[PDB]
Subunit: 440 residues, 4 copies
């Protein structure tokens, strides 16, 4: 499953439909990024630029011109063919092949952008530009507008109105096409296979980073070369650090390990968390905390549907958590009073759900306190957790336990589809999986 040229074209047209007549939208590629000295990190295209192109080169700009209500066209600026640059650093699409390959009307050399961009903006009423997204982009746009403003003797005029297209584009990205959902489904499957593998490989004495290695290898074998975010492998007390990425410790017999990892497949993020015993068997204390987090997730998965909200479902989770923590003596008092005091917050301090897509923390308006009403096509995570610090004033057997369990779902007409349920999460199923692996 992938996103095709025709879908990128549909997206461009959908943006154009929303634009004022006599306008242009400017969408800039990500800059290359230094890792150390003359070496660069592996290139990651800007998500919005990718969304409209599927084009994985830097020094590229998509220009959508809406001349009036019926006439519109697209111009791509991108790197020229250059034999020497290509022998050294890789092939470039160039100008000749770009119109057919990407489905744009015209392509020009990026080297000519300052000589050409102002000519494309001349006489328009509106420019759509994500001001502040990239310094190099702001420089180019500001220079073009200045040339126009100062060019009345050459009969040039600048568009007086600049509109940030990010809100419009992010609202588009918030609602996935069936093709996007298919890509995210595959990302979920790939990510789930990696998590199953980590559970089957984990043994006391392995380092946290060893499970990262297994996970990243599994991503790669299915064609997801890169993770969508830095892998978290937090064993023991490290599980109480939310985005622990050091992954530097030897995993101890008797500790839990929390793994938060996701692949990036055709630009889209998977995002799964599983927590499990390093030695394949939950202790009683570990199981007691685990059960509360799992009940929170299972209830959320029953509830998520069009017409509810992340806020509403969070309320149900908070009650489950406070109730369970009271039962274990971690919290003390009346459940309703404790809920009113947000007494869960020392142990569950983050959100239940974030949007998921071309970014792991995907774009799109949540509403105040994540109250926005859910509709079909939205994709989100469900990630309750409980984190009991090593020095927490709680019964001693719970100290240093960090548990999160996270699935990715899509809202459907009739509820939700769980994209990541192919990796187990019921404690008896986790134990059975690990027992079977440990016998090999």
């Amino acid at each position: 499953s992938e996103i095709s040229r025709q879908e990128f074209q549909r997206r461009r047209q959908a943006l154009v439909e929303q634009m004022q007549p006599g306008s242009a939208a400017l969408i800039f590629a990500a800059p290359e990024v230094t890792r150390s000295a003359d070496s660069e990190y592996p290139y990651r295209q800007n998500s919005d630029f990718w969304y409209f192109t599927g084009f994985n080169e830097p020094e590229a700009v998509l220009v959508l011109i809406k001349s009036d209500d019926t006439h519109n066209h697209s111009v791509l600026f991108n790197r020229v063919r250059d034999l020497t640059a290509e022998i050294w650093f890789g092939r470039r699409l160039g100008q000749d092949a770009a119109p057919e390959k990407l489905g744009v009307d015209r392509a020009l050399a990026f080297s000519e952008i300052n000589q050409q961009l102002y000519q494309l903006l001349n006489g328009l009423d509106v420019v759509y530009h994500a001001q502040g997204e990239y310094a190099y982009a702001d420089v180019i746009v500001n220079s073009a507008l200045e040339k126009l403003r100062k060019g009345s003797r050459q009969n040039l005029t600048a568009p007086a109105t600049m509109i940030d297209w990010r809100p419009v584009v992010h609202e588009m990205r918030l609602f996935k096409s069936p093709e996007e959902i298919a890509v995210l489904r595959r990302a979920g499957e790939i990510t789930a296979m990696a998590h199953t593998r980590a559970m089957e490989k984990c043994r006391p004495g392995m380092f946290e980073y060893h499970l990262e290695g297994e996970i990243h290898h599994e991503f790669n074998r299915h064609g997801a070369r890169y993770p969508s975010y830095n892998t978290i492998v937090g064993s023991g007390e490290n599980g109480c650090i939310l985005a622990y990425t050091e992954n530097e410790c030897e995993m101890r017999d008797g500790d839990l390990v929390l793994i938060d990892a996701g692949c990036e497949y055709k630009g889209y993020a998977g995002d799964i968390t599983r927590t499990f015993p390093v030695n394949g068997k939950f202790t009683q204390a570990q199981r007691e905390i685990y059960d509360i987090v799992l009940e929170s997730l299972e209830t959320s998965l029953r509830l998520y549907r069009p017409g509810t909200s992340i806020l509403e479902v969070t309320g149900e989770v908070v009650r489950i958590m406070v109730s369970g923590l009271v039962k274990l003596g971690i919290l003390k008092g009346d459940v309703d009073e404790l809920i009113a005091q947000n007494a869960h917050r020392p142990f569950f301090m983050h959100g239940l759900s974030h949007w998921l897509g071309l970014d792991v923390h995907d774009v799109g308006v949540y509403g105040q306190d994540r109250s926005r009403i859910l509709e079909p096509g939205m994709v989100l995570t469900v990630e309750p957790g409980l984190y009991i610090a090593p020095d927490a004033e709680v019964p001693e057997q719970y100290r240093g336990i960090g548990i999160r369990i996270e699935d990715d779902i899509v809202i459907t007409e009739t509820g939700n589809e769980n994209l990541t349920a192919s990796v187990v999460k019921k404690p008896e199923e986790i134990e059975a999986l690990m027992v079977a692996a440990r016998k090999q």
Copy 2:
């Protein structure tokens, strides 16, 4: 093998020894780097900052103060302990633990750098600063100097002399300690194991990125979490692109595959290239080109020693290459005349050797045309190659062949030590290795 606190301290002292009395050296950490939106790439410390600290956090500055010829001390600015920031994003060293952990005299919060740095520079004659290394660093230094310049009514004075410490520090980095050589030896071993694995795993129909996956997994299992540069897996015509990193193609029965990959182990780079038949058997044409590249490497390995130079050894390689290409009918004419015309350059267009260390293309002065006389402690690669383009005007059977073979060496009193000879390169040994793997 690693670099210890005491060695980082020795390095700091060695720099101080070279500094003028009444001076301070300022060494800044790398900024964190965005991958997409709110997600960051895995952190990579600045090599020079790492060299003097072994400290892997951003928002840190090492200040070495040489008050006079006997008195000197060190101050680290680094991120404060903060419970909330740490629960979310990871532990921080903080100020209390830094002096003992890192072996610095004093530690202050990075948040106080603008309030404190000018006080440390006040009245000094010289400041050592790598101007232009980082924008955020230049801002801090320039602000401090401005406060001093403009502060005569407060009895403040700025050092009038600013010296770039990069030349001094890079000359230090050019000559490895025995401990650094031990780390590089391990990096070589790890990298060699990964390359052997790639050869043993490679089959027709696998994707180029599959070998990347095997390699990166092997790095990880030995505790080298990250590669030192983006892995190159160039099969068939892709092998003729020097830093081909797309690694997106299905590897064909009958093609060669060129793999250039290296681990980063305790900050240090391995860097190996091996080229081999995807199907385990060189064709005659492939073997003919391979033999020339291998003879070039083997001769270079015999020759490299104190008192010669990369330029001198390159001359020997150029003769081997021109001679071999003439014999195959790829070049035509008198060998000496062809050498004088640099007739090899269409097929061997890069340098034979680069320095190796905390960066894969390591720091240090090469001399004009890489003529600097070699001395013990220098570490460098040896990477001859021949690249015959698909459209080259040569006998047809050689078109589309890209071959490079690369080892990492250290110059010793008596010649050189090859750090990467534990992965095979003789064609009969490559074939035997692959035959044995293909039978499993």
Copy 3:
């Protein structure tokens, strides 16, 4: 004559009337400007900021908030009262007095602008900002918008639409109120008195800068402390340099002197040019060129009216010039063919007319080739000239003659009013004036 608080308020309201509901307009003061080291040039307020405030301090920002179609209000950010700063550098209006003094609703300290501006923009749809006008202003606005964009967890939202208010404001400035015309009339009178004085004071052997001194003293005595642009006193060959401001030469018996000077009175520019003989008597050659320039001006003054254009009147001037130059043998050929070839351009190389107001080259759209149809309330200059270079291929007696004659006019319902006719320009009147002065 001046502009009052109530008029500044009317202007603010007129802008608000043009703004979208749910918007704010941001108008920034000019920065102070270094002359040398710690000394500054005399402060000149930004013309647009002045237009809406009559407030002559730096570090001030006018914010007009249009909450909806009936509700709007104004906030001024300006420097706080500060005893010490004021003892040293002068009084400040401060926050307490500003609402009554300026007629704004609220005033806040400029020091609080970053803490307050984002709160004023929060939830609005549109921000009107002159992007690129001042770096310090862009920094403030961009920072506020960034806080809002990144503040969804604090329920903050940024206006997505940014509109340059310069086109709207400059169209306002293009049409003068009766009060503005009264101020410009006084500027014209003051400027004319200064030019009359220069003619009456000029003698051979005086330096060009001496006439500048007389002019600037005359401006000052009528309460126009500063010129509206750098005074030009170009005698002899210097008159052929359009904006010659060196004014460093001894004025020679037998040369003409061209004086282009104007006062700045209550923010508004006068702009007069007169050219006259240094010794009080035009030579025949000088008179021959002068007559052509004067006929050009006199004809233009008869013609300028609503319904014509600067382009149309320029056409008449070009014919007068080509005809006269042909008669003197400076141009050769058929007048109509010469006009078609723009053969006047070596001798008359600038525009006939520019808008006049708070800037000498005032704001406002001219139309292609200054073709915009004139309407009552527009104020413009009329400044034909002929400049015959020292090395021009023309009859020798004309070489080194530079003549311009310039008046300021306002377009009225019935034609135009000349604001600067109280300084003579007929050659016999110039001679009579100078003869009378030279007898004293």
Copy 4:
């Protein structure tokens, strides 16, 4: 009196003498400065650039190259000859004429500075640059150094050492040549004539700005076109504001007026303050305060000599002031105790003396608390004052009196020479001068 080409050359050579062998010094011209929209303030050259060139154009850079201890040469970058630019905006020196005119070895177009500067710095050990002086200059220098740093393959090397030449150059400027003293003497005379004129012209009912007009006209007639700083005309309570420049009030019968004004003559500043009765007669209260300030000045003029300091002489002034204020009942208590409490500070809140030269507040190190020992060739002001605020808790008759009296002196072998004593300051002489003028 002026500074000649040969003196500018001597200065360049004196700097070169102080430079390390294998170095270059870069001295940049001031940028042009916007007044409003497309109009600029009258150009003021950077004082340090002027000091080494006497060249009054922007877009110019002086490069002094010290190849070794015997060989050195100079290169000027400056604007090219351009017929069109010159017809419009004025003549340019250009490259052909610059070597002879300025006495530099070579001249190149400013447009070529980025193509040429790095070539001049290549292989040098040291660059002298005033970092942070001008943004445009920093950009040029940083770009050149970057080209060199990154150009090892082209055999380029950057100087590692950057030295701020400002301390060396400012120490040069601190000690005036006899020719500089002659120029400053003329500036003093011109400034004194202007102050005498202001006293002779002043009448009740004139505006403060009228005296500014008289002063500026007097500067101009002697060939000092511009003031060295913004003229202060502070009548009545305005005299209690130190740098009151509004000069907007009608001068009242019975008030004092304080005038602080100085010309700029050949780059050098005059700086005189005189305070006098608007109506020509000091009141008793006014005279009582005046006498203390005058005694302070007269004593300082007797004392200033080589071997004392501004700090030492200030001590004498403070005693005079405290003693006088006690006698009038403005201060109460023991004089020595009051001195120890710095009880004068509410009434005399600024320094007695600043250096004077190419800047009114001239460059040069003062020492802690202006304790530097004075030597021949130093030029400084002497400017005691007393400022009794309108609301001061003092006998009512002294409220609202602001008095300063300021002369410019040069330290000589035998004491000092007063450059500004040709304008009167004894109260009886001021009265006599004004009485005589008021009778005309």
